[PDB]
Amino acid sequence: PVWKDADTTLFCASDAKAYETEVHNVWATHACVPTDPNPQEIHLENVTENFNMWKNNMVEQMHEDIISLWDQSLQPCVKLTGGSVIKQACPKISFDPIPIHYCTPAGYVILKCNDKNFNGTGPCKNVSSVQCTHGIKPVVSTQLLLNGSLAEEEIIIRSENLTNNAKTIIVHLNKSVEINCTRPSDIRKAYCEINGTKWNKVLKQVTEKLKEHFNNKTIIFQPPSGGDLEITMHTFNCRGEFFYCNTTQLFNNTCIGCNGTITLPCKIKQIINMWQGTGQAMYAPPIDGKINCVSNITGILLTRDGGANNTSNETFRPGGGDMRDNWRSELYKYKVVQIE
Ligand SMILES: CCCNC(=O)N1C[C@H](N)C[C@H](C(=O)Nc2ccc(Cl)c(F)c2)C1
Ligand SMILES: *[C@@H]1O[C@H](CO)[C@@H](O)[C@H](O)[C@H]1NC(C)=O
Ligand SMILES: *[C@@H]1O[C@H](CO)[C@@H](O)[C@H](O)[C@H]1NC(C)=O
Ligand SMILES: *[C@@H]1O[C@H](CO)[C@@H](O)[C@H](O)[C@H]1NC(C)=O
Ligand SMILES: *[C@@H]1O[C@H](CO)[C@@H](O)[C@H](O)[C@H]1NC(C)=O
Ligand SMILES: *[C@@H]1O[C@H](CO)[C@@H](O)[C@H](O)[C@H]1NC(C)=O
Ligand SMILES: *[C@@H]1O[C@H](CO)[C@@H](O)[C@H](O)[C@H]1NC(C)=O
Ligand SMILES: *[C@@H]1O[C@H](CO)[C@@H](O)[C@H](O)[C@H]1NC(C)=O
Ligand SMILES: *[C@@H]1O[C@H](CO)[C@@H](O)[C@H](O)[C@H]1NC(C)=O
Ligand SMILES: *[C@@H]1O[C@H](CO)[C@@H](O)[C@H](O)[C@H]1NC(C)=O
Ligand SMILES: *[C@@H]1O[C@H](CO)[C@@H](O)[C@H](O)[C@H]1NC(C)=O
Structure with a gap:
């Protein structure tokens, strides 16, 4: 196995329920695939890998997702943006965030640091490879x-x-x-x-x-x-x-x-x-x-x-x-x- 540092467009996976009217389920049903039914975590033996949580493109990717989730999900009676006023109907919605898994396409893999007291930057000596992150709730x-x-x-x-x-x-x-x-x-x-x-x-x-x-x-x-x-x-x-x-x-x-x-x-x-x-x-x-x-x-x-x-x-x-x-x-x- 050999890899290099790379950014790529990820996709998302959820346990979203298609019958739900809740806005996070609605979004992840039409914008994510179903959760990995057989996720495999693969330990990389005596590999030490460096990580940098402050320099990590998945953050900006998840950010773009949660913005588009909020733009489609929430309906304000009035939006005050850039010097114009758009007013629509504001019915009450059902809001309760669900975990979102982030997954690499073909030819990429996600590495996971497992050293318990890792601080986010520097070397990690307990590395695994996964296909999707764990379920993450987008709690604003x-x-x-x-x-x-x-x-x-x-x-x-x-x-x-x-x-x-x-x-x-x-x-x-x-x-x-x-x-x-x-x-x-x-x-x-x-x-x-x-x-x-x-x-x-x-x-x-x-x-x-x-x-x-x-x-x-x-x-x-x-x-x-x-x-x-x-x-x-x-x-x-x-x-x-x-x-x-x-x-x-x-x-x-x-x-x-x-x-x-x-x-x-x-x-x-x-x-x-x-x-x-x-x-x-x-x-x-x-x-x-x-x-x-x-x-x-x-x-x-x-x-x-x-x-x-x-x-x-x-x-x-x-x-x-x-x-x-x-x-x-x-x-x-x-x-x-x-x-x-
Ligand atoms: C011209 C500037 C317009 N600027 C903003 O509208 N700001 C300034 C800043 N960028 C972020 C601020 C924020 O934290 N809003 C927020 C809304 C709902 C929930 Cl639940 C929450 F936890 C937090 C809001
Ligand atoms: C939360 O607070 C409300 C009222 O203060 C109470 O009725 C309820 O039992 C509380 N729930 C928990 C889990 O503490
Ligand atoms: C490395 O992390 C794994 C997975 O979290 C855990 O079992 C333990 O802390 C470490 N195990 C080994 C073999 O290094
Ligand atoms: C949490 O961490 C502190 C030190 O940062 C430690 O003293 C404490 O025992 C820890 N608590 C648990 C439940 O692990
Ligand atoms: C706070 O936590 C303590 C244990 O740390 C527990 O015994 C107690 O019931 C809790 N108090 C309240 C007011 O919830
Ligand atoms: C900081 O304080 C702790 C007190 O437990 C001490 O053991 C440690 O040597 C101190 N370090 C410095 C750099 O002052
Ligand atoms: C951290 O910040 C200080 C002051 O802002 C700066 O002097 C220093 O160069 C920074 N360190 C790094 C590694 O960027
Ligand atoms: C993270 O760990 C490295 C050692 O690998 C250390 O140099 C750095 O200061 C740590 N970051 C913080 C915020 O303590
Ligand atoms: C809150 O934390 C406890 C353990 O600290 C966990 O078992 C529980 O599922 C958590 N609740 C939520 C809603 O994440
Ligand atoms: C945290 O999780 C609990 C259980 O899923 C949920 O009831 C609560 O509303 C959540 N809090 C936020 C701020 O989303
Ligand atoms: C929070 O409460 C304190 C008094 O308990 C008050 O002085 C302070 O102004 C409050 N903060 C805000 C932002 O209103």
Whole structure:
């Protein structure tokens, strides 16, 4: 077996159900093939391969997919794009993401890093070859990574350049923390419940691994200092509704009598700034009754403050400036190569 580094157009595979009206199933039924019924993972013995999650074309490929999934799936009452206004019908839709497998065509193969504490760049000594990645849910989110996979041993810090403060940091947790978001039966006010004990325990460990990477300086968390609501708030879609939740209680440092349930104030917003970059979208008011979603916090997006090089401290705020890193945090151990 011999291969070289290569980019190629991938196809997608799903367990999408053709009878479903849910938009991710609708999309993957007409835009993906069925899941590999006999997927074979092939260990490459005493091969060491280099990987680079920040320089990986599958990320931009998955990105183009999720954009076209959202363009076909969501129907706003009004789109505000490039100085024109298009207004269509905005019926409520069924929204619940499903895992998407990414697969190489003929003559290419996907390599998978399996070293447990791989950080995303550098050599991997435990390499396998696969035909499709594992099922990845396209969870659109800010501040927290939701419903993703877990690191298998220690918590991992991922960055293209930790000494560059403009590069987003991906925190891969080894322990999921549940975040239970409810809009009960003003109709836009909602709330997310988190186990404070669980979260403060994990974040303590996040601080200790960050301190391992910032030469034992004191690690401080802070809320985002300004921006649009999509930045200052943890946003996500629960059943077609766009939730905006204040996380200031999560990135508090004293709790690093607060060991019970954190209750995060949330609001369902009709008008949003589109993460596609294309502008302002307006949706209809939320459905009647209780809107609940229980998700797994599996990672944190952090950007570190600048100008503290002569300081005792490093101060980190939640979030990043590109949906692509959400995809990166599940595609980090994957690499396409051309078979030579
Ligand atoms: C001229 C600029 C237009 N710009 C935007 O409209 N922006 C600016 C930035 N590129 C990305 C921002 C974002 O994160 N939106 C979002 C929407 C829904 C969910 Cl569920 C979510 F988690 C996040 C939105
Ligand atoms: C390499 O990874 C495999 C698959 O995840 C796992 O069984 C173990 O960590 C390693 N095994 C060998 C033989 O290196
Ligand atoms: C990733 O691992 C390499 C060693 O292979 C190391 O040089 C690099 O700094 C690591 N990245 C981070 C963000 O720690
Ligand atoms: C998670 O990682 C930390 C170190 O990063 C470690 O102390 C802790 O035991 C790990 N937890 C689990 C459940 O593996
Ligand atoms: C990381 O960022 C710092 C400051 O932004 C820069 O001086 C350094 O050259 C960068 N390292 C790499 C490997 O690009
Ligand atoms: C949440 O994480 C647990 C393990 O931490 C896992 O068993 C469960 O399936 C996850 N839930 C979702 C919706 O991914
Ligand atoms: C989520 O919260 C609601 C109300 O706060 C509660 O009724 C429900 O049982 C909770 N679910 C889980 C899994 O904690
Ligand atoms: C938080 O997790 C602990 C274990 O870490 C568990 O015993 C407790 O029930 C949880 N508390 C809440 C409020 O969910
Ligand atoms: C950082 O702190 C730990 C404390 O456990 C210590 O073992 C380690 O040697 C320190 N490293 C540096 C470079 O100060
Ligand atoms: C989050 O809540 C705090 C008070 O708990 C408030 O001061 C802050 O302005 C809120 N964030 C936003 C973006 O409104
Ligand atoms: C995470 O997965 C659970 C179970 O599939 C789902 O109910 C929940 O809505 C998901 N969260 C998000 C933000 O998609």
